[PDB]
DNA sequence: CGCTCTGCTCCTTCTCCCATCCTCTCGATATGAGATCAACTAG
RNA sequence: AUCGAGAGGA
DNA sequence: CTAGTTGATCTCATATCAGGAGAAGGAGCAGAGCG
């Protein structure tokens, strides 16, 4: 689930790259003549300011020029009909599948929603099953660096992938950290207990 | 996003080297963030309260600054490294009741003094006076 | 699809057979049966690549099977043995149309007669 | 037996379509000089 | 006013 | 007749992934049929 953080990070990465590009162009058109340049005039703060403002104001997550390409419906206007409406709106989840599709599978209530997503709250119209709401005690992780975990695993009896020979993989336990196969272990039970 | 993602994005950006001979570096190193504020035409730095942003149709945003180092090398590897501190690069809309909102850690009495509802949960932005919520 | 693959497979097959077959078919002339042959229609060439001598050997096996059946059941007449064996061989030739199938049918008949003899 | 004439299936392209009606909010989206002509505007 | 978007109603 | 005034009009000049379905074309092979 991409919350406000990652979405704004995507937008800001794009905007900062554009800002650097504009600074590059402005500096080039000055250094082509030998004369120095003032980076104060090379920085278009409007780039970041207006990009973030536009994306939050219209809900089109992307550049204003590629509005047709951008996904819409992000950044909706907060509902204030009643307090429960506001609370529900602040805990809303969206599947970008596309309401036009007629396959029932993505709209079905999967078993794994237990305790994570409310099984009752969902719009009854064209978006049934695609717009969801968090269960009361559900939480979404913000992420953390795996470096301490990798250091501990190395300190433990885990063997790096380059060192071990391929013959030792068969009976050992592969260890994945954030999808990276980082080594193997011979005593998975004790390792799980320790972790 | 404010604590880590912005700085990580800025640092991950490759420095730009330009050729016309003289060469430039233009490296960004660290970022600063102020609290939401409004400047009138006189330039007095007043704090923008969320209710004022709602009523005057303002954007509740904070200015973002970054330190920039510029170096120039022409001949004989002479280093002209110069630094521009607190360079303004844009404004970041601030989510209400977050760590960097003016309402952070205010008592119910303080919130009512600001014409804010204590029961208001926050978690949204004010863009041109309009309350905006990001859908996961 | 499957029809396209069936024709392509056939194209792959015939050329391999040609590679595995002689430029010209060394036709081994059909051996004419001896006048003492007790095989009905011994001069027929209905079943390709089948020799009269093979039919004689099969009839000999049938004779042995019939002898076993007789000695187990104590059959009285002997001329019936030869006539019955010849009739069985002729029936097998009339039914089958390929050498291997003919031999398999004859062996099946031999097994049937052996089982009947075992039964008594 | 070379060469042509279909013709047969098959893969590729491409173009079309995807209920009705209704409410609301919200964001974005020059100027004059000279020439020509024609109507006067009178002599 | 136009366009688009979104949220809704039956 | 016959020159002078009055308006309109044109030119020119000045900077700086979780569609699908069907119909039309072309492709390559396969064979038939006749010189």
From TrEMBL, chain A:
Domain RNA polymerase Rpb2 span(s) in chain numbering: 76-140
User: Could you tell me where this protein is found in the cell?
Assistant: Nucleus
Q: Which domain of life is it from?
A: Eukaryota
Q: What family does this chain come from, according to its entry?
A: Belongs to the RNA polymerase beta chain family.
Question: What does this chain do?
Answer: RNA-dependent RNA polymerase that catalyzes the extension of a non-coding RNA (ncRNA) at the 3'-end using the four ribonucleoside triphosphates as substrates. An internal ncRNA sequence near the 3'-end serves as a template in a single-round Pol II-mediated RNA polymerization reaction. May decrease the stability of ncRNAs that repress Pol II-mediated gene transcription.
Name the UniProt record assigns to this protein: DNA-directed RNA polymerase subunit beta
Query: Which organism is the protein's source?
Result: Sus scrofa domesticus
